[PDB]
Design a protein around this ligand. Structure first.
Ligand SMILES: Nc1ccn([C@@H]2O[C@H](COP(=O)(O)O)[C@@H](O)[C@H]2O)c(=O)n1
Length: 387
């Protein structure tokens, strides 16, 4: 059968790993490929070098029907090599299964490779701490069978359903935290169930690439030479990480901008509660969707070096360019960082958190369970004095 590789991800981390897989296989210029990476654009100077390369929009975390137009161009027997975001795997594969239904004679699923979205998978797993995980797996497997037979989605445990694909297809899972699955006691049944179908995320794959493939990869992920040089000075580095807000209200976005500037000052100013000392070069890493929030920092701070905000932070993990220290507002990007590199992580007030909620939320709990952070490194945003 002819193999078609599908790279699907609405987010960042899976895409980063999928673009590594493409780079590792980039000598094959005609292997059929379909890219559905909402946050990444393959430069046309690379697209033109490949044949049978296709692109599909994602909408509501699934490929659009435009996928069918692509697959119709391959009228023989086809086996699908599918790369997915774990958290969104059920929706991402939905149009693929629908197409297979219409072409059961010639379309088969060869294998799945699944990659963590980031913190969201582990948080979601925390909320299942009190469940009979062994029973949830069996039910999820049963309901995955119904999905595969009817095309209709109904999971009593949508979270555990993300981890039962091996009951249907050859699968390999790539986890940001293998420790979590091995340390969390309530997850022991799941760890044993997954058996030899998971592995730790290949963060050091970039180091095994060829010199030219390394440059290939950096072009795919938007990390140009100028930014690289900046993060290679022989100086103690601290990177301040920013955040964003859904709200459109100018007013509110302005408050988030003013408050993130204040948080920066708590790290970098001597009177600050989070002062890291005088011996660090300071970088700012805005949130990709920060918009004016990011401009507020650069326009009103000083002695800071900007790292373009649309770069996914996790690139620095995939490339070995992490700083000595990272600090800022809680983000998925922290789940993937070494413990000794964390200064302080700050939390924003919302529905569940109106105080340093005794750290009774899953995010901190996961991090503490894994030992990435201690209580002294958790900060509630509103408790910080206005400097
Ligand atoms: N300062 C930041 C904040 C977020 N991000 C990107 O945004 C993604 C979503 O992060 P949040 O958990 O903060 O929404 C992160 O996984 C990372 O790829 C970033 O690259 N720099």
């Amino acid at each position: 059968m002819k193999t078609i590789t599908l790279y699907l991800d609405p987010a960042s981390l899976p895409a980063l790993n999928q673009l590594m897989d493409f780079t590792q296989n980039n000598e094959d210029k005609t292997h059929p490929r379909i890219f559905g990476l909402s946050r990444f654009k393959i430069p046309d100077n690379i697209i033109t070098q490949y044949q049978n390369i296709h692109f599909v929009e994602l909408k509501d975390n699934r490929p659009t029907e435009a996928l069918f137009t692509i697959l119709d161009q391959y009228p023989g027997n086809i086996e699908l090599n599918i790369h997915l975001n774990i958290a969104h795997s059920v929706q991402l594969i939905r149009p693929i299964l629908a197409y297979r239904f219409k072409h059961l004679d010639r379309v088969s699923i060869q294998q799945l490779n699944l990659y963590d979205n980031g913190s969201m998978e582990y948080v979601d797993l925390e909320k299942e701490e009190n469940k009979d995980i062994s029973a949830e797996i069996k039910q999820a497997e049963k309901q995955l069978s119904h999905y595969l037979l009817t095309g209709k989605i109904k999971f009593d445990n949508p979270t555990i359903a993300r981890y039962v694909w091996q009951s249907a297809f050859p699968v390999k899972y790539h986890f940001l935290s293998t420790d979590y699955f091995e340390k969390a006691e309530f997850l022991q049944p799941l760890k044993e169930y997954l058996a030899e179908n998971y592995q730790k995320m290949d963060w050091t794959a970039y180091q095994q690439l060829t010199p030219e493939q390394q440059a290939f990869y950096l072009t795919l992920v938007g990390f140009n030479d100028e930014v690289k040089q900046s993060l290679e000075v022989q100086q103690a580095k601290f990177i301040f990480t920013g955040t964003t807000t859904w709200e459109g209200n100018t007013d509110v976005r302005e408050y988030y901008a003013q408050q993130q500037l204040n948080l920066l000052n708590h790290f970098t100013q001597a009177e600050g509660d989070l002062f890291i000392g005088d011996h660090y070069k300071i970088y700012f890493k805005g949130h990709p969707r920060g918009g004016e929030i990011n401009d507020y920092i650069l326009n009103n701070a000083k002695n800071i070096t900007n790292i373009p905000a649309n770069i996914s932070f996790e690139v620095l993990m995939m490339t070995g360019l992490l700083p000595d220290k990272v600090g800022g507002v809680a983000s998925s990007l922290y789940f993937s960082l070494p413990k000794e590199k964390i200064s302080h992580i700050i939390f924003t007030s919302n529905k569940q958190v109106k105080s340093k909620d005794a750290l009774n939320n899953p995010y901190v709990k996961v991090m503490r369970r894994l030992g990435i952070i201690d209580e002294s490194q958790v900060i509630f945003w509103d408790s910080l004095k206005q400097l």
